[PDB]
Ligand binder design. Sequence first.
Ligand SMILES: *[C@@H]1O[C@H](CO)[C@@H](O[C@@H]2O[C@H](CO)[C@@H](O)[C@H](O)[C@H]2NC(C)=O)[C@H](O)[C@H]1NC(C)=O
Ligand SMILES: *[C@@H]1O[C@H](CO)[C@@H](O)[C@H](O)[C@H]1NC(C)=O
Lengths: 49, 49
Amino acid sequence: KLTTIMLSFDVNGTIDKAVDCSSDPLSELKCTLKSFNVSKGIYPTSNFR
Amino acid sequence: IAYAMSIGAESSIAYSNNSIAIPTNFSIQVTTEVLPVSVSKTSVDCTMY
Ligand SMILES: *[C@@H]1O[C@H](CO)[C@@H](O[C@@H]2O[C@H](CO)[C@@H](O)[C@H](O)[C@H]2NC(C)=O)[C@H](O)[C@H]1NC(C)=O
Ligand SMILES: *[C@@H]1O[C@H](CO)[C@@H](O)[C@H](O)[C@H]1NC(C)=O
């Protein structure tokens, strides 16, 4: 199905990990903040769900 | 109406080289000062704007 996802890559061109920001609020936070490690706090999020 | 700015009422003090003027009575007055502290915390969104 059509889904927005976030994909990381390493130095070898291999995919490290995926987000799939259509399932979890933390996933939507990760797609919103453009990062896989998120600092402690409150953040507004986008409408990826 | 149009005029020039009154910078203030022109006063004069008699500097008489040996005389002082001393206050003999006082007063207490309360003055109000207003200072802003913050503005409204406006957050805009990527989607829906
Ligand atoms: C010093 O000034 C104060 C006010 O600036 C005077 O106090 C007033 O005195 C009159 C007369 O008794 C009263 O009717 C008022 O109620 C008082 N208070 C105010 C706020 O006006 C005081 O009398 C003065 N003292 C001298 C020695 O001149
Ligand atoms: C890339 O491949 C090399 C093998 O030549 C390996 O030593 C290295 O750890 C790999 N890098 C990553 C990020 O997996």
